[PDB]
Amino acid sequence: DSCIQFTRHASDVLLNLNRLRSRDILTDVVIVVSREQFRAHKTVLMACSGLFYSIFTDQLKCNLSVINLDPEINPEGFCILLDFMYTSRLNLREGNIMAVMATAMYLQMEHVVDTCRKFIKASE
Amino acid sequence: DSCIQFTRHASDVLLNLNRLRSRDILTDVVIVVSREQFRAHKTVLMACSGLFYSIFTDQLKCNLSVINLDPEINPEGFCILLDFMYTSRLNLREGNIMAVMATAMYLQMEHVVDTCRKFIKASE
Amino acid sequence: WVIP
Amino acid sequence: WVIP
Ligand SMILES: O=C1Cc2cc(Nc3ncncc3Cl)ccc2N1
Ligand SMILES: O=C1Cc2cc(Nc3ncncc3Cl)ccc2N1
Ligand SMILES: [Cl-]
Ligand SMILES: [Cl-]
């Protein structure tokens, strides 16, 4: 087509979605991790994670307001990944990289799994 | 902080939100314009428009599944703006610029109003 | 704004 | 990935 494009539009949308998350506006699901609860927007979780995409496209699970993650999932690793979903920023540290990579593999967040693999390989 | 950032994350999120819109997945509102109906995600509309932000933060209107726009709003102008919300791409043409600017002013989409004003000024 |  |  002959469209024009606003460079900062996608980033501004994500910034506003994160502001809605902060203020708990229109959040429609609770993610339960080892008895730690995280409120979020189903559509943002689907847009970021192959696991959530599969969960919320299921005809029965699409209607659930609570999703319980596998007990092996670490709440801090989940929190870091949820922050990444809403900001594009990943708080990757020596002390959390193993939990973050394991959580990203489970959530099916391929780009995160990729940078974790590379950061681990650099330290070996 | 000491975060790393994935450059394409925000664009990939918006692309996936538009794929959900195309497939009518988790859309939670119908916008009615001069008897033309548009399905969308409330959170995306809020993230893009000062008008929708004000509508869906209202304690009564946040629960509506149908929103009727002012009868002066042109369905094509709305359609172009809805596409922009989900893609960052604006199909601005000599034949639609007046309707697009009028719709963007009503929806409170300041960056769109800005480029329309500039494109109109260049033709005078 | 840019030409994409 | 970049340093923001
Ligand atoms: O690594 C990843 C990130 C990711 C996101 C999604 N999401 C969607 N894919 C396609 N159409 C719509 C949506 Cl919402 C699916 C798989 C994966 N895998
Ligand atoms: O031009 C514009 C675009 C736009 C978006 C919104 N959205 C939000 N603002 C702040 N926190 C959350 C959200 Cl969702 C409000 C006003 C305007 N005005
Ligand atoms: Cl990812
Ligand atoms: Cl705008």
PDB file of C-alpha atoms and ligand atoms in Angstrom:
ATOM      1  CA  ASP A   1       0.000   0.000   0.000  1.00  0.00           C
ATOM      2  CA  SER A   2       0.870   3.759   0.225  1.00  0.00           C
ATOM      3  CA  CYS A   3       0.585   3.915   4.087  1.00  0.00           C
ATOM      4  CA  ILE A   4       2.747   6.180   6.311  1.00  0.00           C
ATOM      5  CA  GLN A   5       3.982   4.666   9.608  1.00  0.00           C
ATOM      6  CA  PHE A   6       4.396   6.181  13.096  1.00  0.00           C
ATOM      7  CA  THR A   7       7.745   4.721  14.324  1.00  0.00           C
ATOM      8  CA  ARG A   8       6.973   5.013  18.095  1.00  0.00           C
ATOM      9  CA  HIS A   9       3.340   3.664  17.869  1.00  0.00           C
ATOM     10  CA  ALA A  10       4.032   0.029  18.934  1.00  0.00           C
ATOM     11  CA  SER A  11       6.243   1.133  21.881  1.00  0.00           C
ATOM     12  CA  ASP A  12       3.607   3.747  22.988  1.00  0.00           C
ATOM     13  CA  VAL A  13       0.871   1.043  22.840  1.00  0.00           C
ATOM     14  CA  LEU A  14       2.951  -1.334  25.009  1.00  0.00           C
ATOM     15  CA  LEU A  15       3.785   1.501  27.476  1.00  0.00           C
ATOM     16  CA  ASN A  16       0.033   2.213  27.821  1.00  0.00           C
ATOM     17  CA  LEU A  17      -0.798  -1.510  28.248  1.00  0.00           C
ATOM     18  CA  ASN A  18       1.809  -1.615  31.065  1.00  0.00           C
ATOM     19  CA  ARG A  19       0.183   1.516  32.674  1.00  0.00           C
ATOM     20  CA  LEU A  20      -3.192  -0.336  32.605  1.00  0.00           C
ATOM     21  CA  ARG A  21      -1.489  -3.376  34.212  1.00  0.00           C
ATOM     22  CA  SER A  22       0.082  -1.160  36.984  1.00  0.00           C
ATOM     23  CA  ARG A  23      -3.337   0.378  37.781  1.00  0.00           C
ATOM     24  CA  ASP A  24      -5.064  -3.058  37.479  1.00  0.00           C
ATOM     25  CA  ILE A  25      -7.338  -1.703  34.701  1.00  0.00           C
ATOM     26  CA  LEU A  26      -9.190  -4.306  32.571  1.00  0.00           C
ATOM     27  CA  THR A  27      -6.909  -7.172  33.758  1.00  0.00           C
ATOM     28  CA  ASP A  28      -8.926 -10.349  33.122  1.00  0.00           C
ATOM     29  CA  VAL A  29      -6.825 -13.186  34.526  1.00  0.00           C
ATOM     30  CA  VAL A  30      -4.733 -14.157  37.557  1.00  0.00           C
ATOM     31  CA  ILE A  31      -1.640 -16.317  36.956  1.00  0.00           C
ATOM     32  CA  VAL A  32      -0.839 -18.403  40.067  1.00  0.00           C
ATOM     33  CA  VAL A  33       2.829 -19.418  40.556  1.00  0.00           C
ATOM     34  CA  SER A  34       3.854 -21.297  43.769  1.00  0.00           C
ATOM     35  CA  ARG A  35       1.070 -19.304  45.670  1.00  0.00           C
ATOM     36  CA  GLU A  36       2.231 -15.933  44.175  1.00  0.00           C
ATOM     37  CA  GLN A  37      -0.483 -14.222  42.129  1.00  0.00           C
ATOM     38  CA  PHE A  38       0.029 -12.042  39.045  1.00  0.00           C
ATOM     39  CA  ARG A  39      -2.806 -10.087  37.397  1.00  0.00           C
ATOM     40  CA  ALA A  40      -2.506  -9.557  33.604  1.00  0.00           C
ATOM     41  CA  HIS A  41      -4.338  -9.101  30.299  1.00  0.00           C
ATOM     42  CA  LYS A  42      -4.947 -12.410  28.461  1.00  0.00           C
ATOM     43  CA  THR A  43      -4.261 -10.774  25.060  1.00  0.00           C
ATOM     44  CA  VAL A  44      -0.821  -9.455  26.110  1.00  0.00           C
ATOM     45  CA  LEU A  45       0.106 -12.904  27.577  1.00  0.00           C
ATOM     46  CA  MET A  46      -0.991 -14.568  24.265  1.00  0.00           C
ATOM     47  CA  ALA A  47       0.962 -12.020  22.170  1.00  0.00           C
ATOM     48  CA  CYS A  48       4.169 -12.871  24.146  1.00  0.00           C
ATOM     49  CA  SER A  49       3.968 -16.583  24.976  1.00  0.00           C
ATOM     50  CA  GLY A  50       3.292 -19.729  22.935  1.00  0.00           C
ATOM     51  CA  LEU A  51       1.962 -21.381  26.125  1.00  0.00           C
ATOM     52  CA  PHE A  52      -0.595 -18.614  26.876  1.00  0.00           C
ATOM     53  CA  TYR A  53      -1.521 -18.471  23.183  1.00  0.00           C
ATOM     54  CA  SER A  54      -2.378 -22.235  23.338  1.00  0.00           C
ATOM     55  CA  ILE A  55      -4.204 -21.841  26.728  1.00  0.00           C
ATOM     56  CA  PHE A  56      -6.457 -18.916  25.812  1.00  0.00           C
ATOM     57  CA  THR A  57      -7.357 -20.285  22.326  1.00  0.00           C
ATOM     58  CA  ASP A  58      -8.684 -23.443  24.010  1.00  0.00           C
ATOM     59  CA  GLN A  59     -12.531 -23.319  23.977  1.00  0.00           C
ATOM     60  CA  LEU A  60     -12.752 -24.213  27.733  1.00  0.00           C
ATOM     61  CA  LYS A  61      -9.648 -22.498  29.142  1.00  0.00           C
ATOM     62  CA  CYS A  62     -10.295 -19.167  27.277  1.00  0.00           C
ATOM     63  CA  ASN A  63     -13.061 -18.599  29.904  1.00  0.00           C
ATOM     64  CA  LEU A  64     -10.947 -19.222  33.021  1.00  0.00           C
ATOM     65  CA  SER A  65     -10.112 -16.233  35.274  1.00  0.00           C
ATOM     66  CA  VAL A  66      -7.362 -18.215  37.123  1.00  0.00           C
ATOM     67  CA  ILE A  67      -4.465 -20.185  35.548  1.00  0.00           C
ATOM     68  CA  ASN A  68      -2.179 -22.306  37.748  1.00  0.00           C
ATOM     69  CA  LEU A  69       1.367 -22.779  36.484  1.00  0.00           C
ATOM     70  CA  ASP A  70       3.422 -25.972  36.986  1.00  0.00           C
ATOM     71  CA  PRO A  71       4.741 -26.056  40.623  1.00  0.00           C
ATOM     72  CA  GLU A  72       8.348 -26.200  39.318  1.00  0.00           C
ATOM     73  CA  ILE A  73       7.968 -22.602  38.031  1.00  0.00           C
ATOM     74  CA  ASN A  74       9.770 -19.992  40.100  1.00  0.00           C
ATOM     75  CA  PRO A  75       7.666 -16.846  40.934  1.00  0.00           C
ATOM     76  CA  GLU A  76      10.659 -14.492  40.485  1.00  0.00           C
ATOM     77  CA  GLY A  77      11.445 -15.927  37.004  1.00  0.00           C
ATOM     78  CA  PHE A  78       7.758 -15.490  36.103  1.00  0.00           C
ATOM     79  CA  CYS A  79       7.681 -11.893  37.457  1.00  0.00           C
ATOM     80  CA  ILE A  80      10.813 -10.992  35.362  1.00  0.00           C
ATOM     81  CA  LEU A  81       9.197 -12.475  32.243  1.00  0.00           C
ATOM     82  CA  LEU A  82       5.836 -10.755  32.889  1.00  0.00           C
ATOM     83  CA  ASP A  83       7.715  -7.435  33.200  1.00  0.00           C
ATOM     84  CA  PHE A  84       9.512  -8.214  29.884  1.00  0.00           C
ATOM     85  CA  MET A  85       6.164  -8.936  28.152  1.00  0.00           C
ATOM     86  CA  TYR A  86       4.870  -5.471  29.086  1.00  0.00           C
ATOM     87  CA  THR A  87       8.096  -3.489  28.619  1.00  0.00           C
ATOM     88  CA  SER A  88      10.560  -5.270  26.177  1.00  0.00           C
ATOM     89  CA  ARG A  89      13.060  -5.033  29.136  1.00  0.00           C
ATOM     90  CA  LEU A  90      14.549  -8.203  30.593  1.00  0.00           C
ATOM     91  CA  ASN A  91      16.198  -8.071  34.044  1.00  0.00           C
ATOM     92  CA  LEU A  92      18.690 -10.891  33.341  1.00  0.00           C
ATOM     93  CA  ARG A  93      21.256 -11.452  36.139  1.00  0.00           C
ATOM     94  CA  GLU A  94      23.758 -14.205  37.077  1.00  0.00           C
ATOM     95  CA  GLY A  95      21.518 -15.048  40.078  1.00  0.00           C
ATOM     96  CA  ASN A  96      18.301 -15.432  38.063  1.00  0.00           C
ATOM     97  CA  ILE A  97      19.358 -16.604  34.548  1.00  0.00           C
ATOM     98  CA  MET A  98      18.698 -20.323  35.170  1.00  0.00           C
ATOM     99  CA  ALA A  99      15.140 -19.660  36.559  1.00  0.00           C
ATOM    100  CA  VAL A 100      14.450 -17.115  33.788  1.00  0.00           C
ATOM    101  CA  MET A 101      15.545 -19.533  30.989  1.00  0.00           C
ATOM    102  CA  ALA A 102      13.544 -22.454  32.516  1.00  0.00           C
ATOM    103  CA  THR A 103      10.435 -20.200  32.801  1.00  0.00           C
ATOM    104  CA  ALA A 104      10.887 -18.850  29.203  1.00  0.00           C
ATOM    105  CA  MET A 105      11.185 -22.447  27.880  1.00  0.00           C
ATOM    106  CA  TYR A 106       7.941 -23.437  29.691  1.00  0.00           C
ATOM    107  CA  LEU A 107       6.132 -20.225  28.530  1.00  0.00           C
ATOM    108  CA  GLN A 108       7.511 -20.711  24.954  1.00  0.00           C
ATOM    109  CA  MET A 109       9.180 -17.266  24.659  1.00  0.00           C
ATOM    110  CA  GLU A 110      11.795 -18.166  22.015  1.00  0.00           C
ATOM    111  CA  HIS A 111      13.726 -14.850  21.894  1.00  0.00           C
ATOM    112  CA  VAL A 112      14.220 -14.886  25.708  1.00  0.00           C
ATOM    113  CA  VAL A 113      15.363 -18.568  25.582  1.00  0.00           C
ATOM    114  CA  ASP A 114      17.867 -17.494  22.832  1.00  0.00           C
ATOM    115  CA  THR A 115      19.498 -14.610  24.814  1.00  0.00           C
ATOM    116  CA  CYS A 116      19.673 -16.807  28.004  1.00  0.00           C
ATOM    117  CA  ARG A 117      21.438 -19.608  26.056  1.00  0.00           C
ATOM    118  CA  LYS A 118      23.959 -17.027  24.662  1.00  0.00           C
ATOM    119  CA  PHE A 119      24.601 -15.357  28.084  1.00  0.00           C
ATOM    120  CA  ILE A 120      25.146 -18.826  29.686  1.00  0.00           C
ATOM    121  CA  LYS A 121      27.567 -19.890  26.849  1.00  0.00           C
ATOM    122  CA  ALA A 122      29.653 -16.683  27.352  1.00  0.00           C
ATOM    123  CA  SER A 123      30.232 -17.569  31.075  1.00  0.00           C
ATOM    124  CA  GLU A 124      31.379 -21.219  30.421  1.00  0.00           C
TER     125      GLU A 124
ATOM    126  CA  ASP B   1      18.352  -0.858  36.107  1.00  0.00           C
ATOM    127  CA  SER B   2      20.752  -3.254  34.252  1.00  0.00           C
ATOM    128  CA  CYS B   3      18.021  -4.667  31.894  1.00  0.00           C
ATOM    129  CA  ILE B   4      18.669  -5.761  28.270  1.00  0.00           C
ATOM    130  CA  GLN B   5      15.972  -4.856  25.701  1.00  0.00           C
ATOM    131  CA  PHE B   6      14.584  -6.777  22.699  1.00  0.00           C
ATOM    132  CA  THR B   7      14.228  -4.069  19.979  1.00  0.00           C
ATOM    133  CA  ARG B   8      11.443  -5.844  17.981  1.00  0.00           C
ATOM    134  CA  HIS B   9       9.335  -6.889  21.068  1.00  0.00           C
ATOM    135  CA  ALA B  10       6.738  -4.049  20.952  1.00  0.00           C
ATOM    136  CA  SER B  11       6.218  -4.447  17.162  1.00  0.00           C
ATOM    137  CA  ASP B  12       5.905  -8.291  17.525  1.00  0.00           C
ATOM    138  CA  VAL B  13       3.311  -7.809  20.330  1.00  0.00           C
ATOM    139  CA  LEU B  14       1.242  -5.428  18.155  1.00  0.00           C
ATOM    140  CA  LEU B  15       1.514  -7.802  15.137  1.00  0.00           C
ATOM    141  CA  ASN B  16       0.165 -10.641  17.334  1.00  0.00           C
ATOM    142  CA  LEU B  17      -2.654  -8.440  18.726  1.00  0.00           C
ATOM    143  CA  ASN B  18      -3.631  -7.654  15.097  1.00  0.00           C
ATOM    144  CA  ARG B  19      -3.583 -11.444  14.275  1.00  0.00           C
ATOM    145  CA  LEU B  20      -5.992 -12.004  17.226  1.00  0.00           C
ATOM    146  CA  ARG B  21      -8.208  -9.178  15.874  1.00  0.00           C
ATOM    147  CA  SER B  22      -8.214 -10.741  12.323  1.00  0.00           C
ATOM    148  CA  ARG B  23      -9.259 -14.140  13.750  1.00  0.00           C
ATOM    149  CA  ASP B  24     -11.764 -12.469  16.162  1.00  0.00           C
ATOM    150  CA  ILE B  25      -9.946 -14.014  19.167  1.00  0.00           C
ATOM    151  CA  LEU B  26     -10.732 -12.511  22.612  1.00  0.00           C
ATOM    152  CA  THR B  27     -12.318  -9.355  21.078  1.00  0.00           C
ATOM    153  CA  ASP B  28     -14.554  -7.952  23.834  1.00  0.00           C
ATOM    154  CA  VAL B  29     -16.348  -4.987  22.277  1.00  0.00           C
ATOM    155  CA  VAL B  30     -18.192  -3.912  19.122  1.00  0.00           C
ATOM    156  CA  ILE B  31     -17.781  -0.291  17.976  1.00  0.00           C
ATOM    157  CA  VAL B  32     -20.859   0.845  16.000  1.00  0.00           C
ATOM    158  CA  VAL B  33     -20.306   3.620  13.408  1.00  0.00           C
ATOM    159  CA  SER B  34     -23.244   4.701  11.148  1.00  0.00           C
ATOM    160  CA  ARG B  35     -24.538   1.008  11.279  1.00  0.00           C
ATOM    161  CA  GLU B  36     -21.043  -0.421  10.454  1.00  0.00           C
ATOM    162  CA  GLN B  37     -19.708  -2.707  13.187  1.00  0.00           C
ATOM    163  CA  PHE B  38     -16.060  -3.153  14.199  1.00  0.00           C
ATOM    164  CA  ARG B  39     -14.910  -5.810  16.686  1.00  0.00           C
ATOM    165  CA  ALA B  40     -11.820  -4.926  18.789  1.00  0.00           C
ATOM    166  CA  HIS B  41      -9.981  -5.379  22.091  1.00  0.00           C
ATOM    167  CA  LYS B  42     -10.881  -2.700  24.681  1.00  0.00           C
ATOM    168  CA  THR B  43      -7.259  -2.540  25.935  1.00  0.00           C
ATOM    169  CA  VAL B  44      -5.824  -1.826  22.455  1.00  0.00           C
ATOM    170  CA  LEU B  45      -8.497   0.895  21.859  1.00  0.00           C
ATOM    171  CA  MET B  46      -7.598   2.476  25.269  1.00  0.00           C
ATOM    172  CA  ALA B  47      -3.842   2.309  24.519  1.00  0.00           C
ATOM    173  CA  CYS B  48      -4.423   4.255  21.234  1.00  0.00           C
ATOM    174  CA  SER B  49      -7.263   6.698  21.920  1.00  0.00           C
ATOM    175  CA  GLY B  50      -7.952   9.276  24.641  1.00  0.00           C
ATOM    176  CA  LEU B  51     -11.696   8.812  23.980  1.00  0.00           C
ATOM    177  CA  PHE B  52     -11.640   5.002  24.475  1.00  0.00           C
ATOM    178  CA  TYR B  53      -9.343   5.431  27.485  1.00  0.00           C
ATOM    179  CA  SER B  54     -12.006   7.726  29.085  1.00  0.00           C
ATOM    180  CA  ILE B  55     -14.894   5.368  28.043  1.00  0.00           C
ATOM    181  CA  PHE B  56     -13.451   2.104  29.364  1.00  0.00           C
ATOM    182  CA  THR B  57     -12.177   3.629  32.663  1.00  0.00           C
ATOM    183  CA  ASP B  58     -15.748   4.745  33.420  1.00  0.00           C
ATOM    184  CA  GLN B  59     -17.215   2.406  36.101  1.00  0.00           C
ATOM    185  CA  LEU B  60     -20.461   1.854  34.074  1.00  0.00           C
ATOM    186  CA  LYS B  61     -19.181   1.966  30.480  1.00  0.00           C
ATOM    187  CA  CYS B  62     -16.185  -0.384  31.174  1.00  0.00           C
ATOM    188  CA  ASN B  63     -18.816  -3.203  31.237  1.00  0.00           C
ATOM    189  CA  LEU B  64     -20.507  -2.404  27.909  1.00  0.00           C
ATOM    190  CA  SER B  65     -19.994  -4.831  24.984  1.00  0.00           C
ATOM    191  CA  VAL B  66     -21.335  -2.261  22.433  1.00  0.00           C
ATOM    192  CA  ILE B  67     -20.209   1.386  22.003  1.00  0.00           C
ATOM    193  CA  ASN B  68     -22.067   3.686  19.589  1.00  0.00           C
ATOM    194  CA  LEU B  69     -20.018   6.492  18.065  1.00  0.00           C
ATOM    195  CA  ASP B  70     -21.407   9.962  17.231  1.00  0.00           C
ATOM    196  CA  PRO B  71     -23.469   9.736  13.965  1.00  0.00           C
ATOM    197  CA  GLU B  72     -21.174  12.341  12.328  1.00  0.00           C
ATOM    198  CA  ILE B  73     -18.317   9.777  12.380  1.00  0.00           C
ATOM    199  CA  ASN B  74     -17.505   8.257   9.008  1.00  0.00           C
ATOM    200  CA  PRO B  75     -17.099   4.402   9.021  1.00  0.00           C
ATOM    201  CA  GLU B  76     -14.188   4.510   6.527  1.00  0.00           C
ATOM    202  CA  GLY B  77     -12.270   7.072   8.661  1.00  0.00           C
ATOM    203  CA  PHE B  78     -12.880   4.844  11.704  1.00  0.00           C
ATOM    204  CA  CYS B  79     -11.752   1.686   9.825  1.00  0.00           C
ATOM    205  CA  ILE B  80      -8.484   3.453   8.731  1.00  0.00           C
ATOM    206  CA  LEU B  81      -7.823   4.538  12.327  1.00  0.00           C
ATOM    207  CA  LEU B  82      -8.633   1.079  13.758  1.00  0.00           C
ATOM    208  CA  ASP B  83      -6.141  -0.419  11.269  1.00  0.00           C
ATOM    209  CA  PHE B  84      -3.544   2.193  12.396  1.00  0.00           C
ATOM    210  CA  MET B  85      -4.113   1.281  16.080  1.00  0.00           C
ATOM    211  CA  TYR B  86      -3.262  -2.369  15.366  1.00  0.00           C
ATOM    212  CA  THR B  87      -0.461  -1.838  12.830  1.00  0.00           C
ATOM    213  CA  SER B  88       1.207   1.666  13.213  1.00  0.00           C
ATOM    214  CA  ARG B  89       0.287   2.088   9.466  1.00  0.00           C
ATOM    215  CA  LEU B  90      -1.988   4.930   8.401  1.00  0.00           C
ATOM    216  CA  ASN B  91      -3.659   4.789   4.961  1.00  0.00           C
ATOM    217  CA  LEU B  92      -3.807   8.587   4.496  1.00  0.00           C
ATOM    218  CA  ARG B  93      -5.055   9.697   1.041  1.00  0.00           C
ATOM    219  CA  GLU B  94      -6.310  12.970  -0.518  1.00  0.00           C
ATOM    220  CA  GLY B  95      -9.818  11.416  -0.656  1.00  0.00           C
ATOM    221  CA  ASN B  96      -9.937  10.409   3.023  1.00  0.00           C
ATOM    222  CA  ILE B  97      -7.732  12.941   4.912  1.00  0.00           C
ATOM    223  CA  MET B  98     -10.617  15.182   6.056  1.00  0.00           C
ATOM    224  CA  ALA B  99     -12.646  12.190   7.452  1.00  0.00           C
ATOM    225  CA  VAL B 100      -9.493  10.671   8.995  1.00  0.00           C
ATOM    226  CA  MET B 101      -8.504  13.958  10.756  1.00  0.00           C
ATOM    227  CA  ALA B 102     -12.100  14.546  12.018  1.00  0.00           C
ATOM    228  CA  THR B 103     -12.240  10.937  13.353  1.00  0.00           C
ATOM    229  CA  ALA B 104      -8.744  11.233  14.982  1.00  0.00           C
ATOM    230  CA  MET B 105      -9.804  14.512  16.686  1.00  0.00           C
ATOM    231  CA  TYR B 106     -12.972  12.828  18.070  1.00  0.00           C
ATOM    232  CA  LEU B 107     -11.010   9.680  19.154  1.00  0.00           C
ATOM    233  CA  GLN B 108      -8.229  11.901  20.658  1.00  0.00           C
ATOM    234  CA  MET B 109      -5.324  10.363  18.674  1.00  0.00           C
ATOM    235  CA  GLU B 110      -2.936  13.350  18.824  1.00  0.00           C
ATOM    236  CA  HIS B 111      -0.123  12.012  16.581  1.00  0.00           C
ATOM    237  CA  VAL B 112      -2.617  11.214  13.763  1.00  0.00           C
ATOM    238  CA  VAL B 113      -4.223  14.703  14.120  1.00  0.00           C
ATOM    239  CA  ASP B 114      -0.649  16.164  13.840  1.00  0.00           C
ATOM    240  CA  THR B 115       0.316  14.361  10.565  1.00  0.00           C
ATOM    241  CA  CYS B 116      -3.137  15.192   9.009  1.00  0.00           C
ATOM    242  CA  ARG B 117      -2.697  18.913   9.858  1.00  0.00           C
ATOM    243  CA  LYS B 118       0.818  18.847   8.244  1.00  0.00           C
ATOM    244  CA  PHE B 119      -0.341  16.963   5.079  1.00  0.00           C
ATOM    245  CA  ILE B 120      -3.276  19.435   4.668  1.00  0.00           C
ATOM    246  CA  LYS B 121      -0.928  22.487   5.128  1.00  0.00           C
ATOM    247  CA  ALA B 122       1.447  21.140   2.402  1.00  0.00           C
ATOM    248  CA  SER B 123      -1.447  21.062  -0.168  1.00  0.00           C
ATOM    249  CA  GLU B 124      -2.662  24.683   0.521  1.00  0.00           C
TER     250      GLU B 124
ATOM    251  CA  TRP C   1       6.214   9.468  10.656  1.00  0.00           C
ATOM    252  CA  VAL C   2       8.103   7.546   7.894  1.00  0.00           C
ATOM    253  CA  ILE C   3       7.596   5.757   4.571  1.00  0.00           C
ATOM    254  CA  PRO C   4       7.689   2.067   5.797  1.00  0.00           C
TER     255      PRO C   4
ATOM    256  CA  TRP D   1      18.960  -7.481  22.051  1.00  0.00           C
ATOM    257  CA  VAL D   2      20.536  -4.114  23.087  1.00  0.00           C
ATOM    258  CA  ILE D   3      21.610  -2.089  26.127  1.00  0.00           C
ATOM    259  CA  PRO D   4      18.625   0.395  26.342  1.00  0.00           C
TER     260      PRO D   4
HETATM  261  O1  LIG E   1       8.093 -17.453  21.299  1.00  0.00           O
HETATM  262  C1  LIG E   1       6.898 -17.307  21.049  1.00  0.00           C
HETATM  263  C2  LIG E   1       6.073 -16.053  21.253  1.00  0.00           C
HETATM  264  C3  LIG E   1       4.717 -16.445  20.740  1.00  0.00           C
HETATM  265  C4  LIG E   1       3.516 -15.745  20.647  1.00  0.00           C
HETATM  266  C5  LIG E   1       2.379 -16.389  20.148  1.00  0.00           C
HETATM  267  N1  LIG E   1       1.280 -15.552  19.856  1.00  0.00           N
HETATM  268  C6  LIG E   1       0.530 -15.461  18.726  1.00  0.00           C
HETATM  269  N2  LIG E   1       0.993 -16.069  17.611  1.00  0.00           N
HETATM  270  C7  LIG E   1       0.239 -15.931  16.514  1.00  0.00           C
HETATM  271  N3  LIG E   1      -0.906 -15.265  16.389  1.00  0.00           N
HETATM  272  C8  LIG E   1      -1.338 -14.654  17.494  1.00  0.00           C
HETATM  273  C9  LIG E   1      -0.646 -14.708  18.692  1.00  0.00           C
HETATM  274 CL1  LIG E   1      -1.288 -13.933  20.090  1.00  0.00          CL
HETATM  275  C10 LIG E   1       2.484 -17.697  19.657  1.00  0.00           C
HETATM  276  C11 LIG E   1       3.678 -18.401  19.753  1.00  0.00           C
HETATM  277  C12 LIG E   1       4.781 -17.768  20.317  1.00  0.00           C
HETATM  278  N4  LIG E   1       6.081 -18.256  20.521  1.00  0.00           N
HETATM  279  O1  LIG E   2      -3.521  10.849  21.676  1.00  0.00           O
HETATM  280  C1  LIG E   2      -3.745  10.111  22.634  1.00  0.00           C
HETATM  281  C2  LIG E   2      -3.488   8.621  22.712  1.00  0.00           C
HETATM  282  C3  LIG E   2      -3.909   8.271  24.111  1.00  0.00           C
HETATM  283  C4  LIG E   2      -3.921   7.066  24.809  1.00  0.00           C
HETATM  284  C5  LIG E   2      -4.411   7.032  26.118  1.00  0.00           C
HETATM  285  N1  LIG E   2      -4.162   5.840  26.834  1.00  0.00           N
HETATM  286  C6  LIG E   2      -3.622   5.662  28.068  1.00  0.00           C
HETATM  287  N2  LIG E   2      -3.008   6.718  28.647  1.00  0.00           N
HETATM  288  C7  LIG E   2      -2.465   6.493  29.849  1.00  0.00           C
HETATM  289  N3  LIG E   2      -2.452   5.355  30.539  1.00  0.00           N
HETATM  290  C8  LIG E   2      -3.044   4.316  29.943  1.00  0.00           C
HETATM  291  C9  LIG E   2      -3.634   4.413  28.695  1.00  0.00           C
HETATM  292 CL1  LIG E   2      -4.420   3.042  28.008  1.00  0.00          CL
HETATM  293  C10 LIG E   2      -4.791   8.224  26.747  1.00  0.00           C
HETATM  294  C11 LIG E   2      -4.786   9.429  26.053  1.00  0.00           C
HETATM  295  C12 LIG E   2      -4.362   9.432  24.728  1.00  0.00           C
HETATM  296  N4  LIG E   2      -4.264  10.504  23.827  1.00  0.00           N
HETATM  297 CL    CL E   3      10.381 -13.794  23.510  1.00  0.00          CL
HETATM  298 CL    CL E   4      -1.996   8.780  17.565  1.00  0.00          CL
END
